[PDB]
Design a protein around this ligand. Structure first.
Ligand code: BCL
Ligand code: BCL
Ligand code: BCL
Ligand code: BCL
Ligand code: BCL
Ligand code: BCL
Ligand code: BCL
Ligand code: BCL
Ligand code: HEM
Ligand code: HEM
Lengths: 38, 315, 49, 26, 49, 38, 49, 38, 38, 38
């Protein structure tokens, strides 16, 4: 087996959390939605 | 017919060549596609402005001036060629004087002619609620003339013939001008101000003194970093880093003239015997960032020969 | 591990099932409290507008 | 003639690599 | 590994199949919720224009 | 078994605590709720 | 490695064939989605001009 | 165990992710599409 | 047993002490209660 | 026994001393009691 299941789970979860945080911060700092006092 | 039977006949060895070829091709394609996209979607260069009278400032966008206010301008200009009441502009015809207030004094403040004096009669003095602003404008003009005739003249011609005007400080804002914004206070304490209490030909000298310590050096470093931020050229613009007390680069003297001029401005106009009264500029002390704003020559500085002869560095 | 159900025998020990039950109950209670708090906060001052 | 010469050289490269790869892997 | 289907026996153990099922269900639920959230956000304020 | 129960517990609890503190700090610094002197 | 075809037996094990198949399917789906997205973006705002 | 299949999946996935992130950032910062408040 | 009793007690006590200290400094520094000279 | 007596004594004494010192410094620096020259 080329890759362990554990490595796949860890990598996918880390990438997903990092991407979610990055997307939320980029959308918040853009000032295009009027969320949290404009 | 091969000399590499182990590379050209074995299935494993035969896949080396194809794998390497594909890897090289894909790397080249990736680099090419990324840089093509970057160079195709990136914007054009940010051009400069080419006003005949300014360096990097524009008054040309014109909607602050009322469409009706221009008419009374022409009506007054047609009425009388010669100025009835001029104290500072003693040597200009009303045509040139009007072309100068529309171009420079209002363009540097970005305000309508109603902001100073009354459209029905331009030459009346104390018949409207906005006369104190006109008095302050005259005092500001006299200050500009004094600054031009005493400190900018001493600078060599290699720097240029640029002269101080209304847009140099105000930069398109009538009131609310702010020296020391939050942007330029990055690595300094937010209460820090330029120390306009000292004698500048020898005020900030710290090298090999033996009577000072790291406190004075810290204050000097704060001042030096403010100078770095105001010009944007880094610490090597006025200094040879092998020996700071040296006088070589020839912008360390122009900085001395600037320091003396700023001290004169603070002592004469900002707070003459108290800022609360008998002082224009609303008690707002000056700074190198106020005029220069991150460039060697201030963006609002006027090119040589554009301001009126009374206010020019050579009258 | 005779208290673990048949389906989850290859994963859970007998001592970890109780801790898992405690964690699940705690998470459910926290979710209920969180939904109530969010409803109250929206009723106070909407943050979307 | 910048595009035409590039196209000619790239075509020559592709045809030559095809020929040599066919010679090797057969 | 007698619960894994015949095709995936060389790849999956018997204890990892259940965790994989859990992960798949979680991902599908998250996808549905994200689709709903994106639809609501577009209905609120279009970001393309 | 791919993942210890202890490892999952530790990661999930630490993530929850960090996210809760972050979210309270982001809400407090935004100045949109009038909480703790506006 | 009995499931691997005759040609690719010296290169593939029996467990990596399935992973390779999954990767190929994912690549094809991603290519289709990318083509659709590029067509929509071009229809919205041409970039070459 | 043979390294060719594995060393290839990791490198390809990493290159794809990095290039996608970089390209979205370059397009976003160019300001030529009117996306996310112009 | 997944967790020692001593580990749980130590972690809980340290977290409680840190949280209580943080909450008292935050409430003191906001100046919204008129405590210790306003 | 989950905890030694000596460890408990050491931890409690250290925590008490640290808390007392911190409280004295904070109350002195607050300038609200008129102690030690106002
Ligand atoms: C983080 C990701 C998770 C994970 C998430 C999933 C998900 C999610 C699924 C699977 C599924 C499968 N996974 Mg798993 N899986 C993980 C780890 C593994 C490991 C391992 C570590 O050893 C293995 C061997 C497998 C193997 C497998 C198979 C047993 C199974 C079926 C594959 C198949 O036939 O695909 C062949 C089919 C494809 C490759 C489809 C490709 C589709 C492309 C991407 C196009 C999609 C179109 C898109 C949805 C359309 C969008 C519309 C919008 C409106 C624009 N996974 C990791 C840890 N796995 C699937 C399953 O069990 O289904 C019942 C499934 O749904
Ligand atoms: C509001 C409109 C905004 C925007 C705001 C956001 C925000 C904000 C987010 C995304 C996210 C995503 N966006 Mg969007 N997005 C926009 C426009 C786009 C466009 C586009 C071309 O216009 C595209 C292609 C996308 C595409 C995407 C995906 C990459 C992703 C959602 C799908 C996914 O992977 O779900 C898969 C996700 C999951 C399976 C998550 C499942 C989570 C489960 C339910 C647990 C959650 C935590 C749980 C509650 C914690 C507490 C309990 C304890 C666990 C016990 N967006 C515009 C500009 N987008 C989301 C994302 O996932 O980013 C990484 C995200 O956070
Ligand atoms: C902005 C408007 C509101 C506000 C809006 C909200 C909203 C809305 C919510 C909260 C929530 C909470 N808020 Mg708040 N909040 C406000 C102001 C406050 C103030 C304050 C001083 O004013 C306080 C003290 C709090 C505190 C709290 C918590 C009670 C709670 C989050 C708990 C947490 O961290 O979960 C995350 C914590 C963890 C994951 C750690 C748990 C630790 C466990 C319990 C202990 C285990 C110990 C043992 C040894 C561990 C063993 C395993 C180990 C790995 C070894 N808020 C203002 C007034 N707040 C949330 C809530 O209700 O939660 C229930 C919520 O949804
Ligand atoms: C921090 C996380 C906790 C944890 C928290 C929970 C919680 C919480 C639950 C379980 C439950 C389960 N867990 Mg546990 N569990 C953990 C660790 C483990 C470990 C391990 C480490 O070895 C294992 C093997 C398990 C295994 C299992 C099963 C025994 C059991 C049923 C799973 C199932 O069928 O999912 C298949 C089902 C799904 C994957 C559901 C997916 C749903 C998606 C995400 C959509 C949700 C939509 C949402 C609810 C609606 C949103 C509404 C809003 C208003 C918008 N857990 C860790 C320590 N576990 C569940 C249980 O006991 O149920 C009786 C349960 O409720
Ligand atoms: C006031 C309105 C604010 C806001 C303020 C907050 C605050 C503040 C918090 C959240 C938190 C959360 N917010 Mg909210 N939130 C807003 C808008 C949103 C929106 C949205 C799209 O509008 C969404 C989707 C969310 C979603 C979420 C979740 C990620 C999370 C709550 C659910 C959860 O996981 O509970 C699961 C939580 C638990 C299971 C915790 C259980 C804790 C147990 C009960 C013990 C608590 C500690 C206890 C008191 C300690 C003492 C006893 C000793 C232990 C013995 N928020 C706006 C901007 N939100 C909370 C959170 O948990 O973040 C991580 C949080 O702290
Ligand atoms: C808007 C118009 C822009 C532009 C913007 C972009 C952007 C933005 C991107 C590209 C990307 C690409 N562009 Mg384009 N591009 C332009 C013009 C061009 C031109 C041209 C000559 O005009 C060319 C030849 C290309 C060529 C290309 C390719 C290199 C690539 C898309 C194909 C590909 O490799 O798919 C292969 C891709 C895959 C196989 C990915 C499959 C992914 C699967 C479906 C999973 C996705 C994540 C998933 C949702 C996560 C959540 C679930 C969890 C995984 C469980 N572009 C102009 C200038 N281009 C895209 C790319 O792929 O970059 C890496 C990209 O992101
Ligand atoms: C004044 C109003 C302030 C405020 C000020 C405080 C302060 C100050 C504190 C809290 C604390 C808490 N606040 Mg409050 N809080 C406010 C608003 C809120 C809101 C809200 C949404 O409005 C919420 C949800 C909370 C929630 C909470 C909880 C997280 C917590 C109390 C419960 C707990 O865990 O008890 C569990 C607590 C215990 C079991 C303590 C047991 C201690 C034992 C008895 C020993 C004590 C030491 C002893 C005297 C030492 C000497 C003797 C030697 C030992 C021999 N606060 C506002 C903003 N809050 C308290 C806390 O514990 O934070 C961690 C805390 O210190
Ligand atoms: C002056 C008014 C100030 C204030 C100033 C202080 C100061 C200053 C201190 C406290 C301390 C405490 N304060 Mg108080 N405090 C105020 C308001 C409050 C309020 C409140 C809600 O208003 C509360 C709840 C408290 C609560 C508390 C307790 C946590 C604690 C005292 C009890 C204790 O634990 O004794 C338990 C204490 C002991 C068991 C110590 C026993 C020591 C033995 C007798 C030996 C002493 C040393 C000895 C002389 C050394 C020489 C001999 C050699 C040993 C041989 N304070 C206001 C703001 N408070 C004291 C403390 O101990 O904090 C940790 C402390 O130092
Ligand atoms: C050009 C000669 C010139 C004019 C004209 C002018 C006008 C002017 C006015 C009307 C004000 C007051 C408006 C309001 O009520 O505050 C004002 C105030 C300030 N000025 Fe000035 N000014 C002219 C020239 C200059 C120059 C060259 C400088 C820079 C050295 C300068 C600076 C200031 C400052 C500072 C103020 C304080 C205004 C503030 O909002 O605090 N002026 N000027
Ligand atoms: C860059 C941040 C920077 C440093 C560092 C620096 C140093 C420095 C020293 C040590 C002195 C005094 C040394 C002595 O014994 O005379 C000094 C004095 C002056 N500097 Fe400076 N300097 C830095 C930056 C700059 C820049 C960018 C300029 C030009 C604007 C400049 C100019 C001057 C001037 C003028 C003096 C004379 C001070 C006085 O005579 O009181 N410095 N600097």
């Amino acid at each position: 087996r080329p890759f362990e299941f554990r490595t796949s789970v860890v990598v996918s979860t880390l990438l997903g959390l990092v991407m979610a945080l990055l997307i939320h911060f980029v959308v918040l700092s853009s000032g295009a939605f009027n969320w949290l006092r404009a | 017919p091969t000399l590499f039977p182990e590379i050209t006949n074995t299935v494993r060895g035969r896949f080396y060549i194809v794998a390497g070829i594909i890897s090289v091709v894909m790397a080249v394609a990736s680099i090419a596609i990324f840089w093509w996209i970057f160079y195709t979607i990136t914007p054009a260069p940010a051009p400069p402005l080419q006003n005949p009278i300014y360096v990097n400032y524009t008054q040309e966008p014109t909607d602050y001036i009322s469409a009706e206010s221009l008419a009374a301008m022409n009506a007054y200009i047609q009425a009388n060629p010669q100025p009835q009441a001029v104290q500072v502009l003693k040597g200009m015809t009303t045509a040139q004087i009007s072309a100068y207030m529309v171009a420079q004094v209002s363009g540097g403040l970005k305000v309508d002619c109603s902001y100073c004096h009354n459209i029905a009669n331009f030459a009346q003095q104390d018949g409207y609620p906005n006369a104190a602003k006109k008095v302050t404008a005259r005092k500001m003009m006299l200050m500009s003339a004094d600054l031009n005739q005493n400190y900018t003249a001493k600078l060599p011609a290699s720097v240029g013939g640029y002269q101080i005007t209304c847009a140099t400080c105000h930069n398109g804002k009538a009131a609310g001008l702010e020296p020391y914004p939050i942007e330029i206070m990055n690595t300094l304490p937010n209460d820090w101000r330029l120390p306009l209490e000292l004698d500048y030909p020898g005020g900030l000298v710290v090298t090999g003194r033996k009577d000072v310590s790291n406190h004075e050096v810290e204050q000097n470093q704060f001042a030096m970093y403010h100078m770095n931020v105001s010009m944007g050229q880094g610490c090597t613009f006025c200094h040879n880093a092998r020996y700071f007390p040296s006088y070589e680069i020839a912008q360390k003297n122009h900085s001395i003239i600037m320091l003396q001029m700023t001290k004169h401005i603070q002592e004469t106009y900002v707070a003459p015997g108290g800022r609360i009264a008998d002082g224009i500029m609303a008690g707002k002390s000056p700074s190198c960032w106020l005029c220069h704003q991150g460039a060697n020559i201030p963006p609002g500085a006027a090119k040589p020969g554009q301001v009126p002869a009374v206010l020019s560095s050579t009258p | 591990n005779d208290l673990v159900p048949d389906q989850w025998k290859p994963l859970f020990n007998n001592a970890q099932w109780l801790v898992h039950d405690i964690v699940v109950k705690t998470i459910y209670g926290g979710l209920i409290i969180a939904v109530i708090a969010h409803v109250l906060c929206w009723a106070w001052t909407p943050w979307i507008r | 003639m910048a595009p035409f010469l590039m196209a000619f050289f790239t075509i020559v490269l592709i045809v030559a690599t095809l020929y040599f790869l066919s010679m090797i892997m057969s």
